[PDB]
Write a protein that binds this DNA or RNA. Structure first.
Lengths: 247, 302, 59
DNA sequence: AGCAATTTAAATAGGGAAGATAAGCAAAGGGTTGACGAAAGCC
DNA sequence: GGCTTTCGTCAACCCTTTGCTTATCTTCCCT
């Protein structure tokens, strides 16, 4: 027995489009799983999965180059060079209207759940982008599978993410089978021995290289199983769909 | 030391006619100006294509735009406004120095009989292309700055001497020799006959069900301004072995006859322009042809 | 970021004519202070254009 | 002061012409966006 | 003894010019 809260038409601008070194565009499912665990921390409603779809999404720039951001002189000790233009590190920006659907388990009324999600989203930040606007979130429940599809079709219109898996690698199949690659998680390289320059000193830290899976965009109504669009934190330091690989 | 023509050298049209609207009047009450509508008819016949003696009898249905005089009016009226513009050697896209040396190579061109041939082509009714074939008389009325001129019988092939064409051509050549402009409001009255068929200009349409599609201004039969202007500039009797006046072209070229009368005999416009800018003294007819091209207009470069 | 992904992806997606991509010069004006691959491949690295399909508003 | 009838059938066919052309110029700029290494005054 | 400023150091390309998908609709039935 499943419960969901849907925030439709989440207009967000200033999204850090740099998903990884080789992916620029839509934020991956690690971003929205991070947003889900962020509310698990601030609001206390513990979130299993998030199904996110893109209503609108434009990467700022041309069709072959992204619009770089005019950097500001914010480091310490480079005064004197501040009159000249700051050097640009690559961070593409994008705008996106999203539709989010969080699997939550809740025991109180739907009004306080909607208010808690609204108070989170008013202080949230989708992929480094300020949430410009969002409709009032609404609670829908998936008692059975037809009710699961009711929740699924309540995200209309949006293009959700379905996992199609890795055959050999990322570049090969992106040309061959023409699917989109995105960060489904990370791979740990080395333990980090210096916790002085970090957010926490006690949380263990690892250098990571983003693993990618290959995904497709399908409209939420054309997705047969809603579990193939709900991304959640898998126990391989990755994220994964509940329904597995989309067929 | 040859003065090469710039690639960007272009002259504008300095004889600008309007679209010649075609009305129907009687020969008596020419103020009863009723407009000739283009109708559309579909006509059955046979296909008689040169290389098809098999489709010969099968049949041929064609949708053609037609325009006719109404059966209560025997006179076609053609109304348009020629606009002779001066400043004829300032190329609006050309270089300064090449157009200046072409201007000071062509200051002594006889503009008088150039203007006479233009106004004669207006007055004899060459702007009526097929609308003159079959006509008891052709009356051309030209209003030139509050001065009405009347023209009854002028053979179009040769430029006969008369005082009214010369009178209009006086200020037309005064415009073409210097600054300013002159407007010629032309009204043609062809006594075609009761219910006679008139000939407007035809448009080119590529993927259309109409076999022939005439030019229509809000449904009214009309001639294209380029056809009227071609009939203005049909003054060239100065090419090699000239028998009839042809349109002034940079190559002396006509499309229907499939021959260029000035290509391959070093009498084309570009060779005489390079001669004018390099000290070759031009003849009077040769200067007049080059200046007629300069007021026809065109880009001459490369 | 994986360096093999950047270099081999740029070489392969230029080789296999995959033009659903962005191109970014990493080091800036003079990328030799960044990285030897940024120093030599001055034309920019190929990354995937990860834009999703849009929803047409008029429907 | 509303009442206005029902069915029945709507033409078979033959044709939709090809031949021509579809300009040549000349332009299309760069200006900022550099991090390590190394002298070298300065707390 | 670092420390912060400014000047000197080290380079060199082969590019390509839209789809990715493509929207949430009536049979029984009796009241």
């Amino acid at each position: 027995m499943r419960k969901f809260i849907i925030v439709k038409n989440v207009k967000v601008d200033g999204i850090n489009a740099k998903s990884s070194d080789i992916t620029v565009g839509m934020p991956p499912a690690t971003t929205f799983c991070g947003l889900g665990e962020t509310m698990s921390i601030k609001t206390g409603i513990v979130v299993k999965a998030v199904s996110y779809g893109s209503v609108k999404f434009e990467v700022r720039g041309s069709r072959f180059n992204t619009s770089v951001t005019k950097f500001a002189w914010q480091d310490r000790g480079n005064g004197g060079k501040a009159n000249n233009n700051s050097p640009i590190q690559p961070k593409p920006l994008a705008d996106g209207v999203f539709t989010l659907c969080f699997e939550v388990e809740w025991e109180d009324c739907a009004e306080v759940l909607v208010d808690k999600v609204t108070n989170f989203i008013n202080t949230a930040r989708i992929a480094g982008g300020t949430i410009a606007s969002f409709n009032k979130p609404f609670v829908k429940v998936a008692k059975d599978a037809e009710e699961l599809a009711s929740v699924k079709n309540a995200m209309m219109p949006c293009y959700v993410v379905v996992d199609c898996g890795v055959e050999v690698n990322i570049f090969e199949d992106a040309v061959n089978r023409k699917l989109q690659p995105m960060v489904n998680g990370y791979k740990k390289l080395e333990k980090i021995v210096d916790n002085k320059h970090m957010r926490d000193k006690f949380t263990p830290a690892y250098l990571a290289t983003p693993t990618y899976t290959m995904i497709g965009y399908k409209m939420v109504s054309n997705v047969d199983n809603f579990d193939q669009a709900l991304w959640q934190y898998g126990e391989n330091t990755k994220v994964k769909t509940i329904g597995g690989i989309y067929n | 030391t040859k003065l090469k023509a710039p690639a960007v050298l272009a002259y504008s049209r300095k004889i600008n006619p309007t679209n010649a609207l075609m009305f129907a009047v009687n020969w008596s009450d020419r103020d009863n100006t009723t407009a000739v509508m283009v109708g559309t008819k579909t006509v059955a016949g046979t296909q008689s294509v040169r290389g098809n003696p098999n489709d010969a009898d099968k049949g041929n249905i064609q949708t053609v735009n037609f325009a006719n005089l109404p059966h209560n009016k025997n006179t076609l009226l053609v109304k348009y406004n020629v606009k002779f513009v001066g400043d004829v050697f300032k190329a609006e896209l050309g270089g300064g120095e090449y157009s200046n040396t072409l201007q000071t190579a062509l200051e002594n061109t006889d503009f008088g009989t150039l203007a006479y041939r233009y106004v004669y082509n207006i007055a004899a009714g060459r702007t009526l292309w097929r609308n003159r074939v079959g006509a008891e008389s052709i009356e051309t009325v030209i209003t030139v700055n509050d001065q009405t001129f009347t023209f009854s019988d002028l053979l179009v092939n040769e430029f006969d001497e008369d005082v009214d064409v010369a009178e209009i051509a006086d200020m037309v050549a005064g415009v073409l020799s210097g600054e300013g402009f002159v407007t010629l409001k032309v009204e043609h009255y062809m006594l075609l006959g009761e219910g006679s068929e008139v000939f407007p200009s035809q448009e080119f349409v590529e993927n259309s069900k109409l076999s022939k599609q005439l030019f229509d201004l809000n449904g009214q039969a009309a001639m294209h301004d380029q056809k009227i202007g071609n009939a203005i500039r049909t003054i060239d009797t100065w090419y090699e072995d000239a028998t009839t006046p042809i349109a002034v072209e940079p190559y002396g070229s006509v499309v229907r006859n499939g021959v260029a009368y000035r290509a391959g005999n070093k009498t084309d416009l570009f060779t005489l322009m390079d001669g004018a800018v390099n000290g070759k003294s031009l003849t009077e007819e040769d200067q007049m042809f080059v200046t007629a091209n300069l007021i026809r207009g065109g880009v001459f470069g490369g | 970021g994986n360096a093999h992904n950047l270099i081999s992806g740029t070489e392969y997606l230029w080789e296999h004519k995959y033009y659903n991509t962005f191109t970014q010069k990493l080091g800036g004006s003079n990328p030799q202070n960044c990285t030897h691959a940024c120093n030599k491949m001055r034309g920019g690295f190929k990354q995937f254009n990860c834009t999703p399909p849009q929803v047409e508003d008029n429907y």
